[PDB]
Design a protein around this ligand. Sequence first.
Ligand SMILES: [Mg+2]
Ligand SMILES: [Mg+2]
Ligand SMILES: [Mg+2]
Ligand SMILES: [Mg+2]
Ligand SMILES: [Mg+2]
Ligand SMILES: [Mg+2]
Ligand SMILES: [Mg+2]
Ligand SMILES: [Mg+2]
Ligand SMILES: [Mg+2]
Ligand SMILES: [Mg+2]
Ligand SMILES: [Mg+2]
Ligand SMILES: [Mg+2]
Ligand SMILES: [Mg+2]
Ligand SMILES: [Mg+2]
Ligand SMILES: [Mg+2]
Ligand SMILES: [Mg+2]
Ligand SMILES: [Mg+2]
Ligand SMILES: [Mg+2]
Ligand SMILES: [Mg+2]
Ligand SMILES: [Mg+2]
Ligand SMILES: [Mg+2]
Ligand SMILES: [Mg+2]
Lengths: 206, 80, 60, 63, 67, 143, 141, 64, 55, 145
Amino acid sequence: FTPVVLATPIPEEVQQAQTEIKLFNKWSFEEVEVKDASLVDYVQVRQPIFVAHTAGRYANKRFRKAQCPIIERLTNSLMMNGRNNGKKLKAVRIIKHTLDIINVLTDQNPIQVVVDAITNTGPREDTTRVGGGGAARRQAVDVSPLRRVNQAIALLTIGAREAAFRNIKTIAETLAEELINAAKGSSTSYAIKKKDELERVAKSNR
Amino acid sequence: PGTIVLYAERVQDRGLSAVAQAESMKFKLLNGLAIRRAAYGVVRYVMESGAKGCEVVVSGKLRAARAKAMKFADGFLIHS
Amino acid sequence: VLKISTRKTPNGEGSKTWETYEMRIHKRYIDLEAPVQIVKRITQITIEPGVDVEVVVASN
Amino acid sequence: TPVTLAKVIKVLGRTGSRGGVTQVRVEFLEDTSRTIVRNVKGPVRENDILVLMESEREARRLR
Amino acid sequence: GRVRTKTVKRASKALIERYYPKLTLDFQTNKRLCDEIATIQSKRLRNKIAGYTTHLMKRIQKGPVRG
Amino acid sequence: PGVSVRDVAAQDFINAYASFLQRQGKLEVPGYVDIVKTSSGNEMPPQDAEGWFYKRAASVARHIYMRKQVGVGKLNKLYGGAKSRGVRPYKHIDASGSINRKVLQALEKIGIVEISPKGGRRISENGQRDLDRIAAQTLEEDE
Amino acid sequence: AVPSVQTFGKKKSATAVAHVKAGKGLIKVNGSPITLVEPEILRFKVYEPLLLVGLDKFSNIDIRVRVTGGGHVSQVYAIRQAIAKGLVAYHQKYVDEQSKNELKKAFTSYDRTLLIADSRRPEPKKFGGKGARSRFQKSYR
Amino acid sequence: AQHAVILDQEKYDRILKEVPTYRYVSVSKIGGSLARIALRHLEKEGIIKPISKHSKQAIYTRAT
Amino acid sequence: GNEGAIRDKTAGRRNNRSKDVTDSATTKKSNTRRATDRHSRTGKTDTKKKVNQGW
Amino acid sequence: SLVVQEQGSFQHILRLLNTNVDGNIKIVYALTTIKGVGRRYSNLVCKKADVDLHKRAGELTQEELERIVQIMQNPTHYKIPAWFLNRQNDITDGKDYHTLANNVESKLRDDLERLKKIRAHRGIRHFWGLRVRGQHTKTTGRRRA
RNA sequence: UAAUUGCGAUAACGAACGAGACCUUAACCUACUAAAUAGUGGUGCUAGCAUUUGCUGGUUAUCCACUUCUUAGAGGGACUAUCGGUUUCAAGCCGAUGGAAGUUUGAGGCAAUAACAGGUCUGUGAUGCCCUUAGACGUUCUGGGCCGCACGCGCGCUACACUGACGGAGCCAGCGAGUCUAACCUUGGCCGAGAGGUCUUGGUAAUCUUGUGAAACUCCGUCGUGCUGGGGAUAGAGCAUUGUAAUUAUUGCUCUUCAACGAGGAAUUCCUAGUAAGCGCAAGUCAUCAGCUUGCGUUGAUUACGUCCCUGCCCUUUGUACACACC
Ligand SMILES: [Mg+2]
Ligand SMILES: [Mg+2]
Ligand SMILES: [Mg+2]
Ligand SMILES: [Mg+2]
Ligand SMILES: [Mg+2]
Ligand SMILES: [Mg+2]
Ligand SMILES: [Mg+2]
Ligand SMILES: [Mg+2]
Ligand SMILES: [Mg+2]
Ligand SMILES: [Mg+2]
Ligand SMILES: [Mg+2]
Ligand SMILES: [Mg+2]
Ligand SMILES: [Mg+2]
Ligand SMILES: [Mg+2]
Ligand SMILES: [Mg+2]
Ligand SMILES: [Mg+2]
Ligand SMILES: [Mg+2]
Ligand SMILES: [Mg+2]
Ligand SMILES: [Mg+2]
Ligand SMILES: [Mg+2]
Ligand SMILES: [Mg+2]
Ligand SMILES: [Mg+2]
């Protein structure tokens, strides 16, 4: 890997992780593939970067929010509740923490099992509030392929955000215990719960 | 004494600078002039005195216990 | 920048509208190299009403 | 579970009362140049793609 | 969202009315005409007069248009 | 190579000066470090408590080194943090002016800081070589 | 007198003033090596200019930067900016264009505001509530 | 004050044979404080693999 | 006096939580001439060939 | 530190100073279920009586304990300054004490009834059960009377 | 379209006020002018470590050079440009590229005509009339009160913790202000746990206070889920400061006392990008007193990029016996 050395010391550690095959500080940005046909084109993995802190205007135009490195747009979705409005540098650290955990048990690429964590919390169908006249029903609606992800990620955080409250387990671990179930939905995740029941009543109506 | 003295310079064509004309009506309405007459007097003076435009407002009461307010304006006036 | 922030109202009624005023100051020094008789040649036509002028020597 | 391949041809406009929805005519990536249009909740551009559960169904504009 | 005022629009048609030999299809040229051919009062103002004149010129080289 | 304080990681350097000055012995601590809160603005005293004078007497000087000079005041501001006035909003207040005024003298009697002209306390020339032996020691961590 | 430039980098209040010597490749922000400046996760955010353009790329230059103003992150974004432009201004005076255009093209095809100086800026508050757009809470009698 | 937050002698037996079978480790028998630097009493000997770095969240893993 | 103030029982939040708030505490603006405003109450007018002599 | 695992020296509960203490809590942090005790007045005394705080409560073999109290029942013969404690100049013998007992409840009344006995305006307030220190009292402190 | 902003239709044609223009502020210039009250490089003089010549500092002028940074002058620059998509292929809008900038460039300043019995006689030596005017409603002086406490309402501050408090340690802004007949901003040396005290000094200020070493925030520890070390009301005892005067405790510190509060019913507020929200700072006030306001920067999102359902208000049409105009 053709090392280069000079006066200021640069690790073999980061002089080994540069434009040889680009992965994150410790994890692969290749091999993260969406296992959902839709959410192609709306979950920006591949183009890489190795720590999520980017001064990028993402809301001056409508959809530029979508080409955001998605694991970043996960991360600012922890700097929440006022208590944490700010704390990005704190935020960025719980993901680094949350991400060394998941390789706890799941050999799988960590930024794979997050993209498998939001795949299966996208509330494909939902309900509305029809005007309809007085006591009127809900209408079976089909969320967008990016309100899917925005709802996916917010649903993922809010449930670990309340999981970590009142208890010792770290916000790194709650987030960690959430994505594994969310990787393929199994039966506990606060996120898939609120998804199924935000969809099982898209069927109360037809 | 000597650190200042003061000298008197008449004002060029006073009917462009307002306080000259502002005070002018004061001494017309204080000498019994009709409000419309005196005001229309200054406005037609101020115009033949050069100004591109003019405007005078009179507010308060003249012998009617509720206050009215007229405006008298000629020519052009930017306001913005 | 000399700012004055004040409520517009003489009284305390109404929506609470403030208004900053501003007075802006410009002060220029220039270091000179001249003799003891143009001490008073740029002094007197050196003025235009509005500009306070101050010159004395030092390095002390 | 029967799922669907639906890409939006081009799209119509905001139906619904407060305006959070829009009818969107879409193309079936299986047996293409198809019929029907469904409608959404989220923001959408053209070129998009999305699942439907029952494609033998369409509602018309929302009240 | 700026439709341009007619103070600029009235002027831009008042010069295409009388300078087509001049009035190149480019702004920077057209800009540097009006400093010399017109008596506008601010950079910003003349920039959209020239920026307009150009856009008209682009379209008369496609057909006519009103005015 | 040639090392310097700039070349070394803040906290695992300054806490090496701790272990050094702890196990050297010439301190002259004023004796009254059993109590002090390190400012009005702090709730409780430091917890190291056989020590933490050394860990302050390590950051005592790395700051004094990096700059021309300082006085007792500017240190009070440095360490002084937010003070929770209970139900009233948090405020910054200066740290304690004596726990600093002769941590300075206490280790200028040891000769690592010099009572500067212009006002202030410049880094000592000898302290300027209780410099890069500083972390030649601590570059031995990843030697 | 050896071939050398100055540049800068600006994130909102921070400005980062960079001098690139022709040297034996030193990089010391404010006296100190890039090796650790500890907003430590945000390190790689200023490590990356090296890694993107290929790191080698340093072996007859010499970089060191100062930062006034700013904040514990307002500066780290202003330096990595300040150094990239540095190295590209070096490749303007002293080496060719194609060997220059390869970096501004390798930079802008990743750039995290690396050469375009981010334009954003604090908005001024107006009376009616502590906050730029915020208003105070209201009564409705 | 609930469940045994100190050495609790026969606790020091369970800790010995509970360290295998774990893909995870953290402060999450135990009470929190005595756990915290129990942890690197363990990397004293080849119990662990400290794949984490820093405080307020720590992650070791099976001896390898 | 102060001997007064303590002795006379008469007093204290105990002697006051004992009792009940007058319901007028809890009551509204009562609006005190804000529906009548446009109608002059001076009982007087201004002549028209006197206003014409003023303006 | 490092783990250590000791004998059944450790006892869960022991009362002392007319007050209880959990064994499983810190022995520089339990220690504050007495009255007149601060996290600070107590922090100080411990390794003033040569005991290491780092360990738990049903620990820390009794001998010290018999006169950790001698340092708080008698804190200026044993080197703690008279601005660190709750009663200087006390009111009537110029001495400087600490009070830590049910006697803190007591020494409250001693002064409370002092100002009452004396007609002091701040007694009167207290007798009436109000805010004493000049707080506005209309809008505040309403329902816990 | 933000706009009676325009296109277009057109018995109307062509204009003005108001909108726009404009002004100010924040962003762009390695291009003009250059500054020891702004700073960069070299070099003197000099300190340390390594040595191979280096790296990191010191130096109110030791000299020499420069203007990138800083400053404020003069210019320039954007005009929604180019291209494309949409459309009466009109005004326009939308996407991409370029770009300091492409949301009226962001934020303000100004702002026509009319309306109100809106508020202000408690800002005015502005004022009509009325009242009083020596046992005064004039005026000063002494003391109290505006703080008074069964309760109802509203703007707020600190919190219920483990994205935490705490303890070290890392340690980064910007808008200001500041002392003459003077007592203002204060560095620096001591003494004091602290508050403070004391001995001197710089500054009428880009020169000194000040890099305002602010705070959140980053590091490493101690705590362990338990009203806990979260929380800091209430309360006692003492020491300080402001002031002629601190009691009804002006403010500051110290010790101790250690509540409610375990995420808030009906309801309702503010807000779309460096915005929200958290964070602290200067200024006003000011002898002492910010939980207030006016500005500032620090850290920095979520979700919109839509509609008229709610609510409000404009606009046509229409009815009108109202024009003091539905009070
Ligand atoms: Mg106009
Ligand atoms: Mg600090
Ligand atoms: Mg600190
Ligand atoms: Mg608090
Ligand atoms: Mg605040
Ligand atoms: Mg206690
Ligand atoms: Mg310049
Ligand atoms: Mg672009
Ligand atoms: Mg009225
Ligand atoms: Mg008045
Ligand atoms: Mg009066
Ligand atoms: Mg009052
Ligand atoms: Mg209010
Ligand atoms: Mg802390
Ligand atoms: Mg003393
Ligand atoms: Mg408690
Ligand atoms: Mg506390
Ligand atoms: Mg809530
Ligand atoms: Mg103040
Ligand atoms: Mg006020
Ligand atoms: Mg009609
Ligand atoms: Mg009615």
